Ligand binder design. Structure first.
Ligand SMILES: [Zn+2]
Ligand SMILES: [Zn+2]
Ligand SMILES: [Zn+2]
Lengths: 101, 112
């Protein structure tokens, strides 16, 4: 819902590890949230978006890499017809922890 | 937050560029890997670390256990531990990939 979520290497990734593509549907926004304990590593694959982490908003283009440490708030705004697609890795992942602002 | 590649580590057959050093949790690491033109990375296995590859640019015969893919941009891979991998760069282009290491408690790398 809101953005797609395409897990890879399911059951193959060590304890607390996780990897997946996500696809932020076009001209949609992902709302302010944070993770209690998990890290997000992004590699921006295609499209363009506004990406906030803590106190900084980036104009995320492909080939950018981002880190979201925990208790750090993030959002994306896609203002493009093309979907925003990113490679995600989650570190110290204890399952679902998204506290949604 | 954003990745600024300002640190190069040179291993001759290639170069490794770490990312977010100190920022990542224990057992984690992330880095770009540049396999310099016409070069190969020789057969090698990792004690326990896992290596997730996202292939950024170029083509290089990539070999994980028994399957040699031709790693193009957009491919994703995993090299579970105790798995023999290597890379032959074919082009006059760097073969570049975003790597994360999982279960990395320092250099578990070993080479055949
Ligand atoms: Zn997110
Ligand atoms: Zn390796
Ligand atoms: Zn694969």
């Amino acid at each position: 819902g809101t953005y797609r979520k395409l897990p890879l290497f399911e059951g193959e990734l060590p304890e607390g590890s996780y990897a997946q593509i996500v696809e932020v549907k076009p001209k949609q926004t992902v709302k302010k949230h944070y993770h209690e304990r998990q890290y997000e590593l992004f590699y921006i694959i295609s499209g363009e978006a506004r990406l906030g982490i803590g106190d900084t908003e980036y104009q995320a283009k492909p080939g950018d890499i981002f880190l979201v440490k925990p208790k750090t708030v993030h959002w994306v705004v896609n203002e493009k017809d093309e979907p925003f697609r990113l490679f995600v890795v989650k570190l110290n992942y204890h399952g679902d922890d998204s506290v949604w602002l």
